[PDB]
Design an enzyme around this catalytic site. Structure first.
Site, PDB file in Angstrom:
ATOM      1  N   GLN A 177       0.825  -1.203   0.000  1.00 45.47           N
ATOM      2  CA  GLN A 177       0.000   0.000   0.000  1.00 45.47           C
ATOM      3  C   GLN A 177       0.860   1.254   0.000  1.00 45.47           C
ATOM      4  O   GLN A 177       0.563   2.223  -0.707  1.00 45.47           O
ATOM      5  CB  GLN A 177      -0.930   0.008   1.207  1.00 45.47           C
ATOM      6  CG  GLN A 177      -1.806   1.236   1.244  1.00 45.47           C
ATOM      7  CD  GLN A 177      -2.593   1.358   2.516  1.00 45.47           C
ATOM      8  OE1 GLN A 177      -2.326   0.664   3.493  1.00 45.47           O
ATOM      9  NE2 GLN A 177      -3.588   2.230   2.510  1.00 45.47           N
ATOM     10  N   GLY A 216       3.106  -6.578   6.287  1.00 44.40           N
ATOM     11  CA  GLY A 216       3.607  -7.882   5.883  1.00 44.40           C
ATOM     12  C   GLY A 216       3.994  -7.945   4.418  1.00 44.40           C
ATOM     13  O   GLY A 216       5.076  -8.425   4.071  1.00 44.40           O
ATOM     14  N   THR A 217       3.115  -7.463   3.540  1.00 42.61           N
ATOM     15  CA  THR A 217       3.331  -7.633   2.108  1.00 42.61           C
ATOM     16  C   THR A 217       4.515  -6.803   1.643  1.00 42.61           C
ATOM     17  O   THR A 217       5.339  -7.267   0.848  1.00 42.61           O
ATOM     18  CB  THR A 217       2.085  -7.217   1.344  1.00 42.61           C
ATOM     19  OG1 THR A 217       1.742  -5.887   1.720  1.00 42.61           O
ATOM     20  CG2 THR A 217       0.939  -8.067   1.804  1.00 42.61           C
ATOM     21  N   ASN A 261       8.549   8.566   8.647  1.00 43.58           N
ATOM     22  CA  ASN A 261       7.391   9.434   8.483  1.00 43.58           C
ATOM     23  C   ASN A 261       7.385  10.606   9.455  1.00 43.58           C
ATOM     24  O   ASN A 261       6.887  11.679   9.100  1.00 43.58           O
ATOM     25  CB  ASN A 261       6.104   8.623   8.625  1.00 43.58           C
ATOM     26  CG  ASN A 261       6.022   7.491   7.626  1.00 43.58           C
ATOM     27  OD1 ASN A 261       6.703   7.500   6.603  1.00 43.58           O
ATOM     28  ND2 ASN A 261       5.173   6.512   7.911  1.00 43.58           N
ATOM     29  N   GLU A 275      27.412   5.758 -11.203  1.00 40.85           N
ATOM     30  CA  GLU A 275      28.388   6.717 -10.693  1.00 40.85           C
ATOM     31  C   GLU A 275      28.187   6.982  -9.206  1.00 40.85           C
ATOM     32  O   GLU A 275      29.143   6.926  -8.423  1.00 40.85           O
ATOM     33  CB  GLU A 275      28.308   8.025 -11.478  1.00 40.85           C
ATOM     34  CG  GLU A 275      28.734   7.911 -12.927  1.00 40.85           C
ATOM     35  CD  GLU A 275      29.054   9.258 -13.543  1.00 40.85           C
ATOM     36  OE1 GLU A 275      28.936  10.279 -12.835  1.00 40.85           O
ATOM     37  OE2 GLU A 275      29.431   9.295 -14.733  1.00 40.85           O
TER      38      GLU A 275
HETATM   39  N1  LIG Z   1       5.289   7.215   4.308  1.00 40.78           N
HETATM   40  C1  LIG Z   1       4.218   6.496   4.002  1.00 40.78           C
HETATM   41  N2  LIG Z   1       4.018   5.286   4.621  1.00 40.78           N
HETATM   42  C2  LIG Z   1       2.930   4.544   4.320  1.00 40.78           C
HETATM   43  C3  LIG Z   1       2.006   4.985   3.389  1.00 40.78           C
HETATM   44  N3  LIG Z   1       1.035   4.051   3.293  1.00 40.78           N
HETATM   45  C4  LIG Z   1       1.331   3.034   4.134  1.00 40.78           C
HETATM   46  N4  LIG Z   1       2.496   3.338   4.788  1.00 40.78           N
HETATM   47  C5  LIG Z   1       3.218   2.517   5.774  1.00 40.78           C
HETATM   48  O1  LIG Z   1       2.923   1.153   5.575  1.00 40.78           O
HETATM   49  C6  LIG Z   1       2.979   0.457   6.798  1.00 40.78           C
HETATM   50  C7  LIG Z   1       1.992  -0.705   6.802  1.00 40.78           C
HETATM   51  O2  LIG Z   1       1.980  -1.361   5.554  1.00 40.78           O
HETATM   52  P1  LIG Z   1       0.932  -0.893   4.432  1.00 40.78           P
HETATM   53  O3  LIG Z   1       1.650  -0.155   3.329  1.00 40.78           O
HETATM   54  O4  LIG Z   1      -0.137  -0.050   5.074  1.00 40.78           O
HETATM   55  O5  LIG Z   1       0.292  -2.238   3.856  1.00 40.78           O
HETATM   56  P2  LIG Z   1       1.284  -3.382   3.354  1.00 40.78           P
HETATM   57  O6  LIG Z   1       2.676  -2.840   3.161  1.00 40.78           O
HETATM   58  O7  LIG Z   1       0.748  -3.952   2.067  1.00 40.78           O
HETATM   59  O8  LIG Z   1       1.250  -4.504   4.501  1.00 40.78           O
HETATM   60  P3  LIG Z   1      -0.138  -5.192   4.925  1.00 40.78           P
HETATM   61  O9  LIG Z   1      -1.053  -4.146   5.510  1.00 40.78           O
HETATM   62  O10 LIG Z   1       0.118  -6.276   5.942  1.00 40.78           O
HETATM   63  O11 LIG Z   1      -0.778  -5.784   3.696  1.00 40.78           O
HETATM   64  C8  LIG Z   1       2.669   1.485   7.872  1.00 40.78           C
HETATM   65  O12 LIG Z   1       3.612   1.377   8.912  1.00 40.78           O
HETATM   66  C9  LIG Z   1       2.822   2.835   7.202  1.00 40.78           C
HETATM   67  O13 LIG Z   1       3.851   3.563   7.823  1.00 40.78           O
HETATM   68  C10 LIG Z   1       2.203   6.203   2.762  1.00 40.78           C
HETATM   69  O14 LIG Z   1       1.389   6.611   1.938  1.00 40.78           O
HETATM   70  N5  LIG Z   1       3.312   6.959   3.073  1.00 40.78           N
HETATM   71 MG   LIG Z   2      -1.074  -3.656   3.531  1.00 45.58          MG
END
Ligand SMILES: Nc1nc2c(ncn2[C@@H]2O[C@H](COP(=O)(O)OP(=O)(O)OP(=O)(O)O)[C@@H](O)[C@H]2O)c(=O)[nH]1
Ligand SMILES: [Mg+2]
Ligand SMILES: Nc1nc2c(ncn2[C@@H]2O[C@H](COP(=O)(O)OP(=O)(O)O)[C@@H](O)[C@H]2O)c(=O)[nH]1
Lengths: 432, 430, 36, 46, 43, 54
Positions: free
Chosen positions: A11, A137-138, A199, A247
């Protein structure tokens, strides 16, 4: 010709690409349909079709539909290949283990084709840009396994890493240290550069500088888009000193275990604040060294710089850059390691940063990016080790990961790998 | 895609879920006939999570109404959204339990289990990738506390990996409406402690409290109580149905809330419960949201978390906000009150947002919290069961059904195992 | 064993056309390195 | 065709480059005041 | 040979305790910078 | 709609669903749509092929 394929995971990875790919489209003149209304500066990201239309070299992946499902509906539904965006049925659900052994293995095979099909379309591949997050996780599990296969499949190509490091104080997850400690093995022996960004620091910078008292993730993704734009600005358009990906890898990495620079971008000011302040090359490069503007919650004044990569952009001249370099060297607050008398690699580009309507930054005729490899980063992992250690002692949340089908001995080994890495960074801080 | 089968057991189960299917019909823009009359396109994008398609552009909830008596099903059909359920899902028999856990679990429900399994497996097969099921029942009855657990124990064997939620209703100390209440309660919670992924402890005397305190209703009927419970059930799976900036599901909430498999009991709450005197004098802003979130009066259980240590805290938000305030205000409650949170888990709060707020409202949230104060419920049931089980009181009803006396020993020993193990986690050194 | 091409990537999948029937893309491309 | 078009593009681009660069005032210190004004008004409206 | 057929002794070291970060004591000091008891919820 | 669908596949509703309202003032406005929404843009379905004898 220089080309880069982006492998956005999770995400965080999907949402960042919304800021990045809209930025590249507006930079080159791409309409949201993908067609020019009006030389081949776009070949580093886009590719031509049989209809005279441009398609990006991206692959969006997620283990749950609804994040990517919207992209298939919004204004850019007609810009990205309907198969380019791969989703899933069930997600890892904040679990490195499920995304590394159970759910991911069903969809490792599918993406590895579209990586290859986008690879053969390119002739000379320059590198792979990987966006993921250490928390979920993903973005940790399936992201990790795809580097393991990308390592043995593409042994020479450059794999860059932009990632969200778990924040020292705030977070969105409780189980987030377990993924973070265990993901570090993959970004240690299966990556070439890494850009862990946090963040809170972007939260701090946006409130202090951009006047936005109440930001959201879009206000955070846009600055991440500016940094990657600065790195590839040398490739897309000409420069006085064009710096390719090979580089700046050379003049940042003293040892293969040390590929963790820190990113910095300047200036970041609002128009009202940009109204009453001239922006020279010296002014912005002094802001690139302020610890209040570092994108990682660590103070470089507590450490020493081993290698610093420069990237200017806009209306800049080599005469002023050498003037700004000299003043920075004559500052006892800034330290340098003994065995690096000259620690600068300067890149100059013509085209000024483009601005987005609905954005926050002012349109500025010049800017600068910073990639300084410092040893102050080793405090960030030490915070993670303590929180992981005081969780792992009473054996919390272990039943989730082991019952998935991973062995508990990997937990202790993963903690050791970061422990060994921290010692290596501190040894560099020792001076003869 | 990601589907849920809403189970149902007993008068409490049917009356609670009758309101529940209405409030999600309104969220999805479905008339009492069953057709789609909504206006937004996202109102029908993830409708298949619950609804099942019918010919002629109609939708049937994926519910299985179970009760040993045909009594409440007449009232269920005579409700406003009475005929939205397809009739073949209504499963019932001749003679109820009469607040007798034994008759429901052994002698009467064992005839009714096979038929319910047929409907449940029919609904289970229809969906491609079902996330899990969801059961609403009361622990002070005969059917929902009785055969309602036997449905749980059978289905877990058939489908181990799927998530099973239970919005159970636990009896209250101060006023009870069944005299054999601790007999059924102490012997149903043993079924939960072995076969359940999560349980939410909803107590009525807390629900009666909240209506007067935070809403000032002179005559809160059981409809207003049932709507109050059903707002929680929507709030856990809103992130499942509607897109968000930071999403979550049932399983994502599952992983982060149980540190050990024995602990799956929580106490929920609903944020924008605003009174008809206080709307005039109010400013809808997120610190005011989390202010009312963590106030112990807003809990819907009979336990006070101020007496124990918060293990893990969930905050599932509804509406479009700014997340800096979401992260900051969570941090403020984390640090200003240090002693109520365990020390060996840093950052005991998990946050999630859902972009679309509840219909007719701008800002909202729901709270799920795993606390060690819930052990004050189990010991209270244990003593009230033991004092009734010392003198062999009210026992001839149960042992006349063929049960031996020994399950009461193991159901109370397992129960007192939980309170001792819960206590050691409260008094634990970092 | 480096594929070096999309055709040779799909030319190493474990999917006998005669036996395997009515599969989706992910079932078509299944690799021994994935089943490890 | 595009090969010579690139040459002419480099030509007028370097001419405008020298026009912007050689003015030391605008080179060391330069803002598009109308663009800053426009985005200020847009922010105020939002 | 006749001497390699003789079973051979095997001794292996268990290594040594892992590296402890230099800032760890500072972290332990900082763990109680802002945390306060029953300041908002109450007793 | 009632099919099982392959792994990477668009759902039948969202194959053709329109997004939420781009204007912030109207309800059912998503964060994505408010961040990138352009009502006054209908994407041309550009497509062209051919050119054998040439
Ligand atoms: N800086 C930033 N971090 C994000 C953003 N969206 C999600 N995150 C980070 O992503 C982490 C959680 O994972 P997600 O991206 O929400 O979802 P995922 O990586 O697919 O993992 P799962 O939820 O288990 O499927 C959180 O700790 C957030 O800090 C974003 O738009 N900007
Ligand atoms: Mg996720
Ligand atoms: N919250 C709530 N609880 C209810 C409702 N109706 C009944 N109950 C509870 O259910 C218990 C009695 O349930 P009962 O009818 O015996 O359940 P059954 O034996 O499974 O059919 C009482 O303790 C009530 O508190 C309702 O509409 N709302």
């Amino acid at each position: 010709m220089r080309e880069c394929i982006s492998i956005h995971v999770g995400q965080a990875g999907v949402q960042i690409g919304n800021a990045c790919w809209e930025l590249y489209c507006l930079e080159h003149g791409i309409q949201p349909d993908g067609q020019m209304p009006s030389d081949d500066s776009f070949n580093t990201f886009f590719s031509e079709t049989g209809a005279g239309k441009h398609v990006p070299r991206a692959v969006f992946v997620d283990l749950e539909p609804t994040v990517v499902d919207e992209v298939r509906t919004g204004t850019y539904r007609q810009l990205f290949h309907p198969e380019q965006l791969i989703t899933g049925k069930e997600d890892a659900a904040n679990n490195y283990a499920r995304g590394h052994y159970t759910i991911g293995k069903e969809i490792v095979d599918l993406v590895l084709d579209r990586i290859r099909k986008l690879a053969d379309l390119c002739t000379g591949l320059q590198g792979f840009l990987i966006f993921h997050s250490f928390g979920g996780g993903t973005g940790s599990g399936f992201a990790s396994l795809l580097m393991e296969r990308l390592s043995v499949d593409y042994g020479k190509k450059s794999k860059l890493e932009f990632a969200i490091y778990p924040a020292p104080q705030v977070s969105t997850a409780v189980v987030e240290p377990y993924n973070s400690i265990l993901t570090t093995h993959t970004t240690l022996e299966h990556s070439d550069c890494a850009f862990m960004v946090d963040n809170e620091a972007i939260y701090d910078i946006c409130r202090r500088n951009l006047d936005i008292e109440r930001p959201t993730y879009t206000n955070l993704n846009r600055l991440i888009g500016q940094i990657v734009s600065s790195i590839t600005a040398s490739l897309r358009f000409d420069g006085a000193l064009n710096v390719d990906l090979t580089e700046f890898q050379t003049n940042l990495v003293p040892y293969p275990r040390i590929h963790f620079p820190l990113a910095t971008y300047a200036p970041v000011i609002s128009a009202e604040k940009a109204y009453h302040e001239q922006l020279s090359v010296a002014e912005i490069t002094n802001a690139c060294f302020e610890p209040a503007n570092q994108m990682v919650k660590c103070d470089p004044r507590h450490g020493k710089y081993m290698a610093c990569c420069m990237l200017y952009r806009g209306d800049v001249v080599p005469k002023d850059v050498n003037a700004a370099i000299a003043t920075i060297k004559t500052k006892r607050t800034i330290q340098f390691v003994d065995w690096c008398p000259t620690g600068f690699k300067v890149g100059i580009n013509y085209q000024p940063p483009t601005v987005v309507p609905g954005g926050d930054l002012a349109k500025v005729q010049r800017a600068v990016c910073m990639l300084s490899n410092t040893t102050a980063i080793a405090e960030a992992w030490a915070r993670l080790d303590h929180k992981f250690d005081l969780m792992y002692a009473k054996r919390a949340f272990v039943h989730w990961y082991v019952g998935e089908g991973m062995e508990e001995g990997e937990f202790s080994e993963a903690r050791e790998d970061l422990a060994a890495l921290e010692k290596d960074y501190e040894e560099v801080g020792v001076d003869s | 895609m990601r589907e849920i089968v809403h189970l149902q057991a007993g008068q409490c189960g049917n009356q609670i879920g009758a309101k529940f299917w209405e409030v999600i019909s309104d969220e999805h823009g479905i008339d009492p006939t069953g057709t789609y009359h909504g206006d937004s396109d996202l109102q029908l994008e993830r409708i298949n999570v619950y609804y099942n398609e019918a010919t002629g552009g109609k939708y049937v909830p994926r519910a299985v109404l179970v009760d040993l008596e045909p009594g409440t099903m007449d009232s269920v059909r005579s409700g406003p959204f009475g005929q939205i359920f397809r009739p073949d899902n209504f499963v019932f028999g001749q003679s109820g339990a009469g607040n007798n856990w034994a008759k429901g679990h052994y002698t009467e429900g064992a005839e009714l289990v096979d038929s319910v399994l047929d409907v449940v497996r029919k609904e289970a097969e229809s969906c491609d990738c079902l996330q899990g099921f969801q059961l609403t029942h009361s622990l002070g009855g005969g059917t929902g506390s009785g055969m309602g657990t036997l449905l749980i124990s059978k289905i877990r064997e058939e489908y181990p990996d799927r998530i099973m939620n239970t919005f159970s209703v636990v009896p209250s100390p101060k006023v009870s409406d069944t005299v054999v209440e601790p007999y059924n309660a102490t012997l149903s919670v043993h079924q939960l402690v072995e076969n359940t992924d999560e349980t939410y402890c909803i107590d009525n005397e807390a629900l009666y409290d909240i209506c007067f305190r935070t809403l000032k209703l002179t005559t809160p009927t059981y409809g207003d109580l049932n709507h109050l419970v059903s707002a929680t059930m929507s709030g856990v799976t809103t992130c499942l149905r509607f897109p968000g900036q930071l999403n979550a599901d049932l399983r994502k909430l599952a992983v982060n809330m149980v540190p050990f498999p024995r602990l799956h009991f929580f106490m929920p709450g609903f944020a924008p419960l605003t009174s008809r005197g206080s709307q005039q004098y109010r400013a809808l802003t997120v610190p005011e949201l989390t202010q009312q979130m963590f106030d112990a009066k807003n809990m819907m259980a009979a336990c006070d978390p101020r007496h124990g240590r918060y293990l893990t805290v969930a905050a599932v938000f509804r509406g479009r906000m700014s997340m800096k305030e979401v992260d900051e205000q969570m941090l403020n409650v984390q640090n200003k009150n240090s002693s109520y949170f365990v020390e060996w888990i840093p950052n005991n709060v998990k946050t999630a947002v859902c972009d679309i707020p509840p219909r007719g409202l701008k800002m909202s949230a729901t709270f799920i919290g795993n606390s060690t104060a819930i052990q004050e419920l189990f010991k209270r049931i244990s003593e009230q069961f033991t004092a009734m089980f010392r003198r062999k009181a009210f026992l001839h009803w149960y042992t006349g059904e063929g049960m031996d006396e020994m399950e009461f020993t193991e159901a109370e020993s397992n129960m007192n195992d939980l309170v001792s193990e819960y206590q050691q986690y409260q008094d634990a050194t970092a | 064993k480096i594929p070096k091409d999309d055709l040779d990537f799909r030319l190493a999948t474990l999917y006998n056309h005669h036996t395997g029937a009515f599969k989706n893309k992910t079932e078509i491309l299944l690799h021994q390195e994935t089943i490890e | 065709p595009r090969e010579l078009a690139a040459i002419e593009a480099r030509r007028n681009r370097e001419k405008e480059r020298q026009s912007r660069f050689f003015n030391v005032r605008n080179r060391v210190m330069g803002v598009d005041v109308e663009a800053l004004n426009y985005q200020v008004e847009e922010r105020k409206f939002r | 040979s006749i001497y390699n057929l003789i079973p051979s002794d095997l001794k292996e070291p268990p290594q040594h305790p892992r590296y402890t970060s230099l800032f760890r004591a500072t972290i332990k000091n900082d763990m109680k910078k802002f945390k306060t008891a029953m300041k908002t919820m109450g007793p | 709609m009632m099919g099982k669908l392959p792994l990477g596949v668009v759902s039948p509703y969202v194959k053709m669903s329109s997004g939420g309202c781009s204007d912030p003032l109207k309800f059912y406005a998503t964060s994505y749509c408010t961040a990138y929404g352009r009502e006054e843009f209908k994407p041309r379905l550009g497509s062209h092929v051919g050119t054998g004898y040439k």
